[PDB]
Design a protein around this nucleic acid. Structure first.
Ligand SMILES: [Mn+2]
Ligand SMILES: [Mn+2]
Ligand SMILES: [Mn+2]
Ligand SMILES: [Mn+2]
Lengths: 99, 85, 106, 97, 99, 82, 94, 105
DNA sequence: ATCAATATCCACGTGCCAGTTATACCAAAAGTGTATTTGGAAACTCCTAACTGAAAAGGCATGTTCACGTGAATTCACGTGAACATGCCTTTTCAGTTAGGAGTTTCCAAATACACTTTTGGTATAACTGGCACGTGGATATTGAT
DNA sequence: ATCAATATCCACGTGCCAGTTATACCAAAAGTGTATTTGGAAACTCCTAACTGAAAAGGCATGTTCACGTGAATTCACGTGAACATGCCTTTTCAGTTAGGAGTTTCCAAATACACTTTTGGTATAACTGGCACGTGGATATTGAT
C-alpha cells in the first residue's frame, strides 16, 4: 500500500531541483569554523570580514560542483552511473592538480 | 577565551556533499566518496587560505579581507567575480 | 566651454579615468591619447554585449531586474563569451541545467 | 574624517544598461559582478599591451598596441566587433579637436 | 620457420625504446610544409627562421605525447588497453580545451 | 601523387608519439582524430605568433614570436631564447 | 655593432661552483637561460602586484620575499628566503 | 671599487637585475635590497637544478649536461616538478613509465 | 623443461665537430660621487564592523530498516590491430643568390610637465515604491502499482 | 490500457526591504592652456640567414596471417536509494564592546638625477681538443615453440 518511488527517481528530481537554484549548499556555520580552523593552524589571531568567508564558500562549492561534473564523466566513460573515488582521482590527474 | 577548534571537516556533512554532487548532475554515489570529497575540499581550502593569509601578513593586518581571498584565488587560476575588483 | 573626452569620442565610459589607471598601473612609461579612448570603447562594448544577453535571460524568467543567475545563464550559453570567461566563477551564478542522457530512465 | 571615495564602474554600467534594456533594472550583486568584469578585462588588455610594447622595445602604449592585444585576447566574432567599436571611437576622437 | 613475437611485445619494446630517447618523431619536411600551409591561411608570404619551425615541432610533439598519456589513463580506466577516439575526447574535455 | 599536408603526419609518426606516451594498442580511428587535434593546436599557436609578427611590422616569423605565443596559451617552452 | 645579453656566464660559474668537473652543452645552456628569465619574470611580476595592491610605489626586498613565498613550494621557499636574507644582510654590513 | 655582486657574496649580476627591474615597468622605484635579494634567489635556484642535473649526467656516465639530464633532474624532484609543471623542456623527453596493467605475465 | 631466433648490452677504439680556451678591443653598462626629491614609517585619533551572546524555533541531520537495481564477475564469439616481409618514393643532406632584419641618423608630431579652472562622481541623508520573496490553495503532470 | 498518490507548475495576494530617486556638499579628478622634452617614424645602408636548386639514403605504404582483446550476453550478491522517526544544531534577530582598520600630519632615511670614471661582458677571429656519437664483435638476456 505505501508509495515508494523507485531508486533513481528522487535522484533525478533533486538534480533538476538543485541545478535550477543558486543558494549555497554547504552550511554556513560549519564552513566558517572549518575556515577559521585551517587559518588558525597557519597563523594565529586572525579576524575575517564576513564577505571573506562568503567568497571562500562561493569558490569552494563552485570548485566541487565542477569537479563532480568531470567525475560524473569519468564514471559514465567506464559504463557506470555511480561515481567512485577512482573517478575523482582520474579527474584530478588529467586536470593537473594531482598530476 | 575561545573554544578550541578541531575536526571541523566533519561539519561538511554527507547530505551537503550529496547536494553538491546533484548540482553536478550525479545520479548515484558510492559510499567511499564522502571521505575523498572532504580530502579534496581541505587541500583546496588550505591552498587558497595559505595565499590569502600571506597577503594579509604583507599588509601588516590582522583581518583577512575579501580582496585577499580574491587575489589568492586569482593566482591559483580560479578568478572570482562579485567580491570587489 | 569644457567638454569631457568621453563625449568628444562619443562614449559612455570615462576616457579620462581609463587614462589615469593606465599611467597609475605601470603598464608603460608613456600613454598616447588613442589608447585610453580605444580601450574605453572596447570595455563599453563588451559590457553592452553581456548586458544584452543577460537582460534577455532576465526577461525569459519573468523578472524585471538582472541578478547574477541571469549573468551566469548569459555567459554560459554564448560560446564566445563562455570561452572568454572559462576560468571565471560567478558569485551566486549556478550551473546550466544539464543531465547526461544516459542517466535518464526508460 | 570623511571616508575615501571608492571608485567603481556602477554609473557607466548603468548607462550602457539603459541604452540596451531601457525598462530593466540591476541588483547590487549583479552590479558587483559587472564591476569585477570590467576591471578584469581591463587588466588583461592593458597587461597584454604592456608586454606587446616591451617585446618591441617601445616605451609607449598607443591605440595600436591596445588593438593587437584585443586581437590576441578576444575570441573571433567578439574581437571583430570590438576592434570596430574601438577604431570608430578613436577616429571620431581625432576629428573632434 | 619464421620467428614471430606475439602481439604486444614489439609495442612494449617500442615504448622502452622511445621513452628512453628524446629526438623528434615527426619528420621535419612534412611538418614544415604543414606549418607553411597553416601560416598562409592567416597572412600571405611569410618567412620562418629555422629555429621557429623547430620550436613549433618541439611544442606540438610535447603536447601530443602528454595527451596520449592522459588518453591512455582513460582507456585503462575503462578496463581497456586500446585508446579510442572517445578517450581523447574525454581527456580533452576534462583538461578544458574542448567543451 | 596528391594528398593533403595534414597527411604528412604519417601513421607511423603518430604511432611513435603514442609509444613515447606509453600506449600499447591503438584503434584505427585514432589516426584521423590525432590529425584533427594536431591541426587545432597548430592553428591557435600560429595565429597568435603571426599576430605578434604583424605588430612588429615584420615579414619573418621569429622564434621569439612562437615562444611568446606558446607562453600565451599556457604552453611555456624553454630553450629558444627569452 | 650588436650585443645580445644572456646569463650563460653566471650559470657556468655556478656550475663550476657545484660540479667543478662537469660541462654543459649549448642547448642545455639555452634551457638554463630560459629558466632564469622565467623565474625572474614570475617573481618580479608577483612583487609588482603586491606593491600595487597596497598602494606602494617601491619594490623592496620585503616584496620580493613575499613573492617568493607565493611562487615557490614549501622547502624551496624556506631555503630561498634564507639565501635571500643572507645576501642582503651581508650586502648591508659591507 | 667593488661590484655589488661581490659585496653580496653572489655569482649573479646584482647591477643588471637592478637595471631589468627599472626598465621592466614593475614599479616606479626599486630599493637596493630588492635586486640583491632577487639575484640571490635566482642563483640559489640555478644551483639546485645544476646539482641534480649533474648527478643525472654522472649516472648516465656522461661528463657534460645535455637537456635530457635537466629533464630527469626536474621531473624527479617533487618541488621543482611543481614549480615547472606547466613548462616544456626542449629536447627533454619523458620519464620512463609503463603502466603496470600493460605488462605481461 | 631444451633449444633457436632475436634483441640487447658491453668493452674497446675511432675520427670529428662542438666545446673549451684565450686574446684583444670597447662600447656599453656599472660604479662613484654629488645634489635633490620624496615616499611611507611614525605618531595620533577617528569610527566601522567584527566579535560576542542570549534565546527561541524548525529546518535538516542522523540512523535504521528494507528492497531493488546496479556493478562485478564470468563466458564466449569474432573481427580488428599487431607482426612481418617487401617494394620504392619521399625525405634528407649540400650549394650560391637577394629578401628583409637591423643598424644609424635626423627631426617633427606627440608626449609629459607644470599651473590653473571647472564639474563630474561619490557620499550622504532623507525620501520613496514597486519588485520580489513568501505563503496559499488548486489545477495539472508524473509515477508506480495493477 | 486504469488508477491513486505525489510532486509540480502557476496565478493570486501580501508586506518589506532593496533599489531607485533627488538634494546638496565638495574635494577630488578632469579639462584647459602654456612651454618642454623625446620617442620612433622615416629616410638610408649594411649584412645575416632564409629561399631555391639538385642529388643521395632509409623510412613509408601495402598486403597477408592470426592471436587475442573487445563487446555483448547472462548471474548474483549486496550496497546504495528511499522513507521515516527523532531531536539537535544551525538560523535568525537583537543588543552592546572594542579591536583594528583607516584617516591625517609630521619628517627623515632612502630613493632618483645628473655628470663622471672604471671595467666587465660580449663579440670575433683564430685556436684547440677531448667528449660523445657510432661501429663492431661477442657474451648475455629475453621470448616463444616444442
Ligand atoms: Mn588547530
Ligand atoms: Mn550489470
Ligand atoms: Mn557630476
Ligand atoms: Mn585600539
Amino acid at each position: 500500500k505505501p508509495h515508494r518511488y523507485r531508486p533513481g527517481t528522487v535522484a533525478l528530481r533533486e538534480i533538476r531541483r538543485y541545478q535550477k537554484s543558486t543558494e549555497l549548499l554547504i552550511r554556513k556555520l560549519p564552513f566558517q569554523r572549518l575556515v577559521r580552523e585551517i587559518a588558525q593552524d597557519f597563523k594565529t589571531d586572525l579576524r575575517f570580514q564576513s564577505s571573506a568567508v562568503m567568497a571562500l564558500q562561493e569558490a569552494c562549492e563552485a570548485y566541487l560542483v565542477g569537479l563532480f561534473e568531470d567525475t560524473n564523466l569519468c564514471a559514465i566513460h567506464a559504463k557506470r552511473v555511480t561515481i567512485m573515488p577512482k573517478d575523482i582521482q582520474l579527474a584530478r590527474r588529467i586536470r593537473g592538480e594531482r598530476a | 577565551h575561545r573554544k578550541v577548534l578541531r575536526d571541523n571537516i566533519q561539519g561538511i556533512t554527507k547530505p551537503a556533499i550529496r547536494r553538491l554532487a546533484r548540482r553536478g548532475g550525479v545520479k548515484r554515489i558510492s559510499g567511499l566518496i564522502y571521505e575523498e570529497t572532504r580530502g579534496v575540499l581541505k587541500v583546496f581550502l588550505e591552498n587558497v587560505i595559505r595565499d590569502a593569509v600571506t597577503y594579509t601578513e604583507h599588509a601588516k593586518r590582522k583581518t583577512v579581507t575579501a580582496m585577499d581571498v580574491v587575489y589568492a584565488l586569482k593566482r591559483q587560476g580560479r578568478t572570482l567575480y562579485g567580491f570587489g575588483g | 566651454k569644457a567638454k569631457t573626452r568621453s563625449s568628444r569620442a562619443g562614449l559612455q565610459f570615462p576616457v579620462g579615468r581609463v587614462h589615469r589607471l593606465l599611467r597609475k598601473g605601470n603598464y608603460s612609461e608613456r600613454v598616447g591619447a588613442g589608447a585610453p579612448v580605444y580601450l574605453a570603447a572596447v570595455l563599453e562594448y563588451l559590457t553592452a554585449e553581456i548586458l544584452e544577453l543577460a537582460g534577455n535571460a532576465a526577461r525569459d524568467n519573468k523578472k524585471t531586474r538582472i541578478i547574477p543567475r541571469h549573468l551566469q545563464l548569459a555567459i554560459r550559453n554564448d560560446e564566445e563569451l563562455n570561452k572568454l570567461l572559462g576560468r571565471v566563477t560567478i558569485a551566486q551564478g549556478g550551473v546550466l541545467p544539464n543531465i547526461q542522457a544516459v542517466l535518464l530512465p526508460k | 574624517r570623511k571616508r575615501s571615495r571608492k571608485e567603481s564602474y556602477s554609473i557607466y554600467v548603468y548607462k550602457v544598461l539603459k541604452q540596451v534594456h531601457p525598462d530593466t533594472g540591476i541588483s547590487s550583486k549583479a552590479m558587483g559582478i559587472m564591476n569585477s568584469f570590467v576591471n578584469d578585462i581591463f587588466e588583461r588588455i592593458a597587461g597584454e599591451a604592456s608586454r606587446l610594447a616591451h617585446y618591441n622595445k617601445r616605451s609607449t602604449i598607443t591605440s595600436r598596441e591596445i588593438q593587437t592585444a584585443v586581437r590576441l585576447l578576444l575570441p573571433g566574432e567578439l574581437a571583430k566587433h570590438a576592434v570596430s567599436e574601438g577604431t570608430k571611437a578613436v577616429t571620431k576622437y581625432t576629428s573632434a579637436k
